[PDB]
């Protein structure tokens, strides 16, 4: 990916004199942070693009919804009645999604959760752990996104990241092994942000831009369910085949009712 | 008589200092410049970082 | 301490001319970044996902959610997003911008078109903005603009 | 217009938080349970503000007279269930309209 | 006897949030019906009934 | 009215006099029919018999 800025000279003089900005570090600061913003949102999109639709198969009570953890369904939340005993049932459901992923990957249970604001918030407004039915103001986590997208550690086990631009209420559970190979999605940085500059002699107006190269790949046993590869030699880049709704270390459930 | 008047409560007039009386203002005082905050990055400890 | 005051707000637009109409603020809190702006979007244009547009498997479509931002969708099932009714009056006023994205949000729920992004093929990046006889491949640009607001004291 | 869009629990009235609707109070049956649901509704709005502004979670609340005493008549922290005399806050408008710090 | 006082009520930019660019590069910062009526994203208002 | 105010049709609003009309109040510079707004006060009494 790459970008070019090409600011003007008379602007640099006027901006320096009037406001006090620089007009050069500004666009460089704009360009540098823009590209890393794409990549940071790029990897996350693949993760939700590759997660298996959760709460199905062996993580589903005989019949409740097959796909969504409805808060208004008696079957789903353990016949619970009041608020402080109903948010607790969500913890049990997520716990089920952790062991199932361990079953499909055979390397470990999920230990990081990607959820929208509300789902993260509803975890911060209940007592996570062996305790009576309780609820209150959100104190444990940082549902604020301006500070940082890192809610904290839920149950000492899960790492809860907040999805900023999440369209609906949902959570995605995944596993990350200590070895870098055991991830399920590979980010491959090839070349860092190389800065470029130049100036056309017809205007002398400076032109600058940035260029970078990176790669993305999936774990070989991403489709763990089939017992043989596709065509021996295969393309590790994600597509509508290797990764869409088939990757193993990612389960995603849409939460409705909150 | 000598009235200080006021701007016509118009964005152009207020910016330029043009009044409707005698005294003409220099211009609005600079209260400061407000940018837009930089959104955060959601880690990279949820995937592989193998370099090429 | 003056009869009037002014406040400055600086914005970062997407693409070439800053003050040009229809630009989109870059680091918007609500609106998410156009993740394909620096990559594939800098190479080819995508069809804009609209009502009653029968998609095809593998094609990428763009839409601007009224409260989330710009997204790129790669539909996996051949569907027409008009389904039930055209517009007519399904609910209260609910301008078609609200009806369309909710319809699209429904499809995202059902395993249909899913948000994706990617970079650019090195075959096109190497020749960006004119090289080796190539033409009409101008890389995307970024710029900023500054505006003002004024207040006059009352009595 | 709060309690709408992403902060609207489906099936509600989209703008009001009724105490007589089980959906809004999440099926609570007694004041020690229902009043806590109100605290959750306040939390949901504050986060929503941090989205549409991108500067931080809301940290100041203006509320009507009696609805302040309701906040003062529930166990603000995360606990089992409780209610009783309005002791935590200052519902007296004559002293000062600054009720105090919530949680 | 009499009294006088002058003050100024202002709004902050980016209040509308949804709008990504102002209208004329120089805009009336004072609140207005067209400018800010249930549009200021800083504040959210919730009713309560059956208290 | 209270039902309408919930719908958002009507809302509380408080403004201030434009400085042009502030200076020209009941007199100055030849303006007419622009009086001020006045506030006074009143005192009232009550009587108390004394039973036995």
Author numbering:
A (entry chain AG): 264 to 521
B (entry chain AG): 66 to 117
C (entry chain AD): 118 to 201, 201A, 201B, 201C, 201D, 201E, 201F, 201G, ...
D (entry chain AD): 316 to 418
E (entry chain AD): 471 to 521
F (entry chain AE): 212 to 263
Paper quotes:
Next, we asked if the T4 capsid can be re-wired by CRISPR engineering such that it can be further programmed with a large number of foreign peptides, 930 or one per gp23* capsid protein subunit, on the capsid exterior. Peptides of various lengths consisting of aspartic acid (D) and glutamic acid (E) residues were inserted into the I domain loop by CRISPR engineering. Remarkably, the T4 capsid can tolerate up to 9 acidic residues (9DE) with no significant effect on plaque size or phage production. We then introduced 9DE-gp23, 10am, 13am, Hoc-del, and Soc-del mutations into the genome through CRISPR to generate 9DE-T4 phage (9DE-gp23.10-amber.13-amber.HocΔ.SocΔ T4) and heads for AVV assembly. A 3.9 Å high-resolution cryo-EM structure of 9DE-T4 head was generated, which showed decoration of the capsid with 9DE peptides between residues G201 and A202 of the I domain loops. The six 9DE peptides in each capsomer formed a negatively-charged acidic ring, generating an extraordinarily charged super-acidic capsid surface containing 8,370 additional negative charges per capsid (totally 15,199 net negative charges in 9DE-T4 compared to 6,829 in WT-T4). The 9DE-T4 heads bound strongly to anion-exchange columns requiring a much higher NaCl concentration to elute, and a slightly larger 9DE-gp23* band was also visualized by SDS-PAGE. A head-to-head comparison of WT-T4-AVVs and 9DE-T4-AVVs showed that packaging efficiency was not affected by acidification. Remarkably, however, head to head comparison of the AVVs assembled with the super-acidic heads exhibited ~5-fold greater transduction efficiency than the WT-AVVs, as measured by the delivered luciferase activity at MOIs of 103 and 104. Importantly, the enhanced transduction efficiency of the super-acidic AVVs was also recapitulated for delivery and expression of the full-length dystrophin payload.
